Amino acid sequence: TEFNVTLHGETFHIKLTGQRPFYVSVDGVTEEVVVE
Amino acid sequence: AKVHVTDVVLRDGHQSLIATRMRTDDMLPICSKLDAVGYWSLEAWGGATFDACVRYLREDPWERLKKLRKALPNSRLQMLLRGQNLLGYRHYSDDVVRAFVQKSADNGIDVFRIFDAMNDLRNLKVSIESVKAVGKHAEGTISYTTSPVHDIPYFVNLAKELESFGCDTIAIKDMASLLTPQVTGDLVKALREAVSLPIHLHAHATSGLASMSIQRAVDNGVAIVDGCISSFAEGASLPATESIVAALKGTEYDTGLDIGLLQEISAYFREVRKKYWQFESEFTGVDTRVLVNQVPGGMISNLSNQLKEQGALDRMDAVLDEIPRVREDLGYPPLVTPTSQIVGTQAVLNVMTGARYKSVTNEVKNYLLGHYGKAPSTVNPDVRNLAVGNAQVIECRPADLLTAEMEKLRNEVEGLAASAADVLTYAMFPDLAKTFLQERNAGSLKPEPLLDKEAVTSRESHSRFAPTEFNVTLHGETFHIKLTPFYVSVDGVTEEVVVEILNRPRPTHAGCVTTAMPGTIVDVKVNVGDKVSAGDAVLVIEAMKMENEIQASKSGVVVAINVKKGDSVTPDEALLEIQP
Amino acid sequence: KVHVTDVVLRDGHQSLIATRMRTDDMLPICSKLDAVGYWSLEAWGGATFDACVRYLREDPWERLKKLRKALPNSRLQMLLRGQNLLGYRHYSDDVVRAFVQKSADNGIDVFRIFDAMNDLRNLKVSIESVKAVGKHAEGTISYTTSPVHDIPYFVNLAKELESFGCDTIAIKDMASLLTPQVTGDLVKALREAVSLPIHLHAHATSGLASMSIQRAVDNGVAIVDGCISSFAEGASLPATESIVAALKGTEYDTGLDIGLLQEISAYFREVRKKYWQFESEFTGVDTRVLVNQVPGGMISNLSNQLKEQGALDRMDAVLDEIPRVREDLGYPPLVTPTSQIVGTQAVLNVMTGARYKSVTNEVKNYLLGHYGKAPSTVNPDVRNLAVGNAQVIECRPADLLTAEMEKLRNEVEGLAASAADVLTYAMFPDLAKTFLQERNAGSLKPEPLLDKEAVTSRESHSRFAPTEFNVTLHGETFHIKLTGSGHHGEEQRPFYVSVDGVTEEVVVEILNEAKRKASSAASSGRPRPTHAGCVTTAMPGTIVDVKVNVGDKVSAGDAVLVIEAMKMENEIQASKSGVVVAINVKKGDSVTPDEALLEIQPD
Amino acid sequence: INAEDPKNDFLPSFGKITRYYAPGGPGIRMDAAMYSGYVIPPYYDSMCAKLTVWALNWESVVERGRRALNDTVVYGVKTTIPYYQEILKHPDFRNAIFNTSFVESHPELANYATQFPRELVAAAISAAIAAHEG
């Protein structure tokens, strides 16, 4: 869950929670995602 | 000094490039010109034509000879005869050889090129005596090849014998294009010292060396050379007649020949050949592989077609690998008719069978039992056994064992054969000739017709081109369409549709005049070569219920005009051109 | 001993498939090309620069880079048209110098430099620039025939070319005009007059090129051009293999592995099939050059010209007018560009009913000295009719050209990523702009290659297929009438379409059984074998004899049937021992290998 | 609103515009070449739209400028928007005294914070879901 994603020169600290929607924290900034 | 030239168009040419399928009807129109060139002789009859005329064209080959004789009065006609093998694939009894030569001579033939696959000259002697007997020209033929056993002296020795039999000329027949120019110089030298006779070179072009080979030959005193008219020349055929003539103009060897007349004839044949598109083969070009599989030019477009009919063209590469292996098995015979069909067919069997000599043609068996003659080298004993078992190899001239059968044959065909020629036709291929003679007398012959190069293709073949889904750009918008009355999906929205049916260069130049809107031409206000300034009324068009005048983008000269009054135009078309 | 250059990667496909060969079809076989002992490989130059850009939508500088990397051991050879470079006009000296510099830098080792008119003033800068960069300069006599050309004329040009500092001299017979007799004398007379090795490049169209090569190697020619056999002959050059085979054993033996060559030839044989759409209507030996010296392929563009105009019936006239115009313009060699020039002017004169009443602008420039020195003196009455009293320049036409390199670079600031991009621009600015633009946008779209079987379906139903429709839906019917092409470049090809007499351009972009092998019966109706006792042939033919009746006891190996197949008889024998149950064949019948001809019950 | 990239000496940025939401509400006028999905041909100029902002006075306009530039949402191609926001930020400009040299005389205007693309954040998240599910 507590990932570090290095994409294209940058790294991003990710922390997930949970057609149904995750809530997701990018560098301590949480918002709703939906996958389908 | 002066070199004489024989053309082979009417026989070897189409035999080598379109599977011997040329009709006589496509030969006669250009005969008066062929007759007018100074050809030494024309190769008109013989080889595979006899078979092909009957089997496929459903014409009587005796008729072709009659017609060609009548249409080529001044030229001497030449045939190719395979010694005892005649125009078949096996030896014939002496009385049939004699009768054949008699009839061929009677009906037209002047020169007889006589060769034997094995080079076993015992097999030619009856033919040569019979040709001499009838007072005609006997050209005895060394059928050239290469193997550990063959060399120049071997060939000159055969030439000497052939002179001793009483031949008027000696012929070198390089059926598979195995001569290198170096060898050809030495060989013709060594032949000019050993024989007093004029020499005839016949060099197929498959390897690329035939034209170089001819040069060396003429340098070393060769008298007569074969070429093919340019439309049927090169590759599996022979060097272009014109190219020879051009390469000797000015020299001490100058052939007196009118290269423009030749070109006219070449152009005629170029047109004819298009009819025969269906017999053209991928395998008729320059191929230096021939120097080893040794398949002869006259053979390969026929072999290729033969594999096509069986659905087995994809197997050629295999067959050509198998060929030289079977040739070695049989003691390195020269690969000419009939040895080349024999080896080739056996090779084909082996490939298809997935096993060497599991199946064995009867003619291979006869080969192994000494019935075609003496194999120049020794035959594989295990192959002989597999094929022929413990059985015995004869060592005499195989026709010695053949009872005279002419009278026997006439009786067998009483009530079919309209003539002695019909009896000799029977003799070549009885089974086949019977059905032919029958069908002919009943007016019921049906030649395989020649296919139309673009026949209208059936309604079922059109549909594999037609699209199910596609993108239509109409008025700035594009729309995704998928069809299945049709049912039709416009951007994923399916609607039933019903239909009722109702029964030029693009501009490269900025000077290329165009309409920006399609329509019909009312008037062209200009003729080619006019000088025009920008703004001049050049054309008029009807569009949108009106007529209106297109004017010149650029100043300068009208170079072309690709439009006339009445024509319908579209804006991608260039309607005239103008040079700035 | 003779060295051999192969031309497959340039002149080969240029001569036979309109220069359309992709670089992608060249690389897979490069390691083998590199392995043969080729003297050089002709990879770049001539029309390839144009074609790569115009049609393939590839950067020709890239092709050179890739080919250089994939052919490390072999020396790469280019064809350059002197001041004309790989383009349409003379170029300023600073661009020639820059071009040669970049060609050298990026791979080229040998530079074959020729000028259409043979006006050697036009070659000098190129040759000095090639020498300057430390590379091989092969100066080229571009052969022709006329009252003015004779052997000394050519040896004189060869001497000058030696004097300019050339490493080799090249005889370029573009139109296949050498006769073998002339080629022997000429090479002799050149070996006496010059100390340099000679390079023969003899196209095959007339049938004499192979004989011509023979006479050449006899008289001491050092290097010979051939093409790999799949692309050889006719409008191309003599087959590389055929040359190799004709010298094996001689004092001239080229050390070359003919089987390796054959492998490469086969590779190309396959490639070529993709390009069926560019094959020439006229293949092989075009002897016509040998009646009256009008290059074959000149007559095929001339006819292509007259057809489009509806005027083919005048060709006999035009070919009579051609040599008169060539003579009027002082017997220039008929190559591009001179051949277009002469041919079109001739067409004009015929159509006009008057000689030089109308005159092509390119003819005018020719007469004003703009292309160079005509080998013979031009007709003064023609010049005056065409050009009046005007300034026939008499200097080397680049003398009139201000250095343009700085000028061009500015013109292409913000497109050209590199000097090479600037030199590409220089060759064809209008075209190169759009190319550079499309490239930098990642938007290049090469013309796709057509599938042969698909195009032939659509064209046969093309006069037949309906256009005028009535389309009914949602109560409404709409009268539709289509026009124009959709079978020749249909993703590119737009219809024009009339909805109730209202015509709108449309564009379409495409996005794309009942046959039984399964059946017990063959096409004929005869059963396919059910089991292993069912007797079959392994190749079709006609039955000669059935050696057996409806019930017989048979042992394996017994002659059961005979067939003629491939004109040869074959006795089919019993696979299995036992009883003959059925026989589905009669004498005379034609049969195929999936048919079961008799049945036999085992044991 | 040209399709160029000011960071890279204003080099053209031709290609496809994947998403486009047009600016709106008061003071806003758009004159667009482009639209949603439009593919900018490379043969012509870079101008996808002219954005024209209006307010009752200098202070207000500038604010509305800043706004409308953000308000214009354009995915797929680099635009001059970010650059313009630098200009509108800069005090000499707000102060309303400037001449032709202003751009030249202020190269700093191209050295700006390039906010990280929402098209890249979506990938980084999707990779977190990929590594979390198998």
Ligand SMILES: *C(=O)CCCC[C@@H]1SC[C@@H]2NC(=O)N[C@@H]21
């Ligand atoms: C069927 O009749 C077609 C011709 C038969 C094969 C031909 S005959 C002459 C050539 N030589 C040879 O061995 N096969 C070829």
Ligand SMILES: [Mn+2]
């Ligand atoms: Mn022959």
Ligand SMILES: [Mn+2]
């Ligand atoms: Mn060339």
